[PDB]
């Protein structure tokens, strides 16, 4: 298409909302192909990552981490506004695993305080993407200082299983899973520090030891559990979609499993089926769909234990419904 | 399914064998739906894991690690009945990936010292499946003390590859994977404990380093190997189920291959082939099917070489037979 | 076959080129089965892996690491003549995951300083397959000082896609990915030795703490950069082979994609599609094939970006050729 073609086409302004929630959108594509619009500002802020206080000098698109989900049609175009509030100190730009060139528009967002960009590329493969910052020279630190987040690029026609048959969710959620590496001191107590260059060096020494102090969902331990517990209800499809831009995770439902899993977040590769713990290698995202049939509370996690009950990798999901004693019974609940 | 008739169903027990070692079973489903009934009683016991006389307080299913593989095919029902003896110390439950609801039944099975439970659930996805002990707050400690193990639901008509083509195996093995973080004094010796909960700061700190001291197939270093090697002949079809409750690994049967691979351990999920190494994330079981086409000594390690052969992830097959010089020959033996 | 059928098949004489350069082959098979000869010269060498000076006692196939990519077809005979010159002062041997029997040719490969051997296997298994050092008590340590590399058995068809339309490439690069675990003083200064046994009991202790001090691609950090970057021009086809013989890796060609991915690098198990970051367990080889639509610089990444930009594996493509403004365009340049 010729760039008279393309400011013929229509477009749509996208408001766009904080993980786990996703932007309201439409599983099959409504008319031809549109230029989507999304306008992010980068903001440099302190977060507390735990219970005990622990603070990151984070960088957030859109102010959260991981960045919010962007979602559009495969052959739409994705515009993305990009702005770094003079507030910032920092230089930042943007890269998407779903675009083509210019290590994904990195070389073509580099904005510093102060300064906006706009960045449109077409969404010509399927699936869900990484999008993370990709300044040359420090990308690791901003990376893992959470500034990186993904986006979904639906097949035209909405999800299908491997053999043609139409998957719809009723709902989706964004699980943008974090490794930070946070300083110690010498009696082991986390580090805190003024400004969030102070704490570069530490963070670096920490960074490569490649263990990290904690392993969280939605920027910190325990942040998808009580009042912000994911909800479903047994009957109920739901799409997780799952991201790290960075290091390795193996999610896992406890208690239900992964019906179809696109393990490798690419939707032309047909879907893994009745999956117990699926890997999404780091740089990646991938999506699970699952239909509950209990109701209960269920424990999503990155299932390496240490990092999903120690690290902070754990999430619940609250399902409403009736018990289904053909699936499981206690025959004998326990006793003497 | 009506309620008189799951009543109805012929109930079978059936008594275990410890691994690699597999329980009698048929590949091809006997009959309709049955309730397979297994009897586990729960060993707290150390046990010693290396040729320098590590100690360990294991928790184990059977009173072995990995606990016992149990075999039944899909849409049977497994009645487990869980035992914990008076004399241990520790609360138990179970976690069966391959089950629907309750966290995989570890809701409706903890149990003291002095308790038993019974727990029944329909096997309605076919494939190999982990199951661990879960026990809210603590779960990665005894999953990491050798409280798991794996179970395999098989496709009523047997296993099949891509293209519908039967595969029937002569002999299989479980070989289960466990990650160990055994403490050290200040110089460097592994330390010992008189109970389990007495080495848990101690080994919680080993955890958290993500860096385990030892990883090793049926609980010890060599367990598989020597006089203890598994066995086979030329021609002869094997299925190896291999399992990792915690941890990543990377199967590979040196000198052979993986034929026929489910790495997602789920059969509905066609296997790869070909495979020299094949990939098995943290919390889930994966299988390989191999015809052995040559006689001799073969060595099944987690291909990490440090893991294999520093910290004990290798295990050995003897297998007798004719060579097969046109697959390979040495066409000049080494000479000066 | 036959020996003497196998003795009356043609012979063909191969010069291997160094890494990440590919020896002349065709894609598709030239006549019926031959038996491939290849002759590789074993050299231990000191090598320098960063800009910090620091040292590894490398062990080479054909004097790099990693060793040279060796390409044969399905049913070819591969006929290596390995040898270990008298200036060498290691027993050495070599194991193809690509073979059958012998531990992959390790049993019948052992060669001490000064001997010589030859070697033959039927190249049964179309893939890519790693191979590597293997002596029964030393392992690890070998390996990871380099002695491994990857072989490539096409299809004697060529290759295909998923369903069954050719994939021929413009192009091939053979990218090894090393990891090393080099010894520090207390100081945190990388320590040096006057013959490679003289690191053995330091770099043992290094690995085993599973975190290599190094990760790079062609034995060196930025091996693969400036004027060594891989090229390529717009509308070009190019399949890039990994191999990881130790350790777990995660490749994305930022700014690009993998258009075909085998990532268990078997080409009997259907690519994946349109892959952002695609996998290869430690002790595998993988292919991505990939068109290139955008000119410019891309970065080939191991995606865990500290031991990528930390560590050290990181390579370059420049392209050359047209910008493609349809797929990414800069609507708005970075600005106040
Ligand atoms: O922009 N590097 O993944
Ligand atoms: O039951 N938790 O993996
Ligand atoms: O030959 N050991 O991977
Ligand atoms: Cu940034
Ligand atoms: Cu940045
Ligand atoms: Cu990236
Ligand atoms: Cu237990
Ligand atoms: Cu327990
Ligand atoms: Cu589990
Ligand atoms: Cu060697
Ligand atoms: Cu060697
Ligand atoms: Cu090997």
Redesign the interface.
Known sequence: ???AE?AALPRQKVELVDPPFVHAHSQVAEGGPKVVEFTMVIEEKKIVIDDAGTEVHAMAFNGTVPGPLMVVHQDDYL?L?LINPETNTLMHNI?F????????????????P?????????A????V??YHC?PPGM??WH??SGMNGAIMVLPREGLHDGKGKALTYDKIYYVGEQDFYVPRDENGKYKKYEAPGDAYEDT?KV?????PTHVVFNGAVGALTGDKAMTAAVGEKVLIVHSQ????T?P?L????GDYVWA???F??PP????????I?????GAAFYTF??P????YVN?????????GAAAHFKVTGE??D???????????
């Open positions: 298409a010729t760039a393309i515009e506004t890269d695993h779903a675009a083509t060139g210019a290590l994904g528009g990195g070389g073509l967002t580099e904005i510093n102060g300064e906006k960009t706009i960045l449109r590329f077409k010509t493969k399927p699936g993407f990484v990709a990308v690791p990376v893992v670096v960074m490569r030891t490649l263990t831009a960075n290091r390795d193996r896992n406890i208690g239900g499993h490798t977040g690419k032309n590769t893994d089926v009745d999956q117990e713990t699926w890997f290698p780091g740089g990646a995202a049939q209990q209960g509370i269920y424990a299932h390496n234990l240490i990092e999903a009950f120690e690290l018990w289904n053909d699936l499981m019974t206690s025959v004998l609940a326990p006793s003497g």
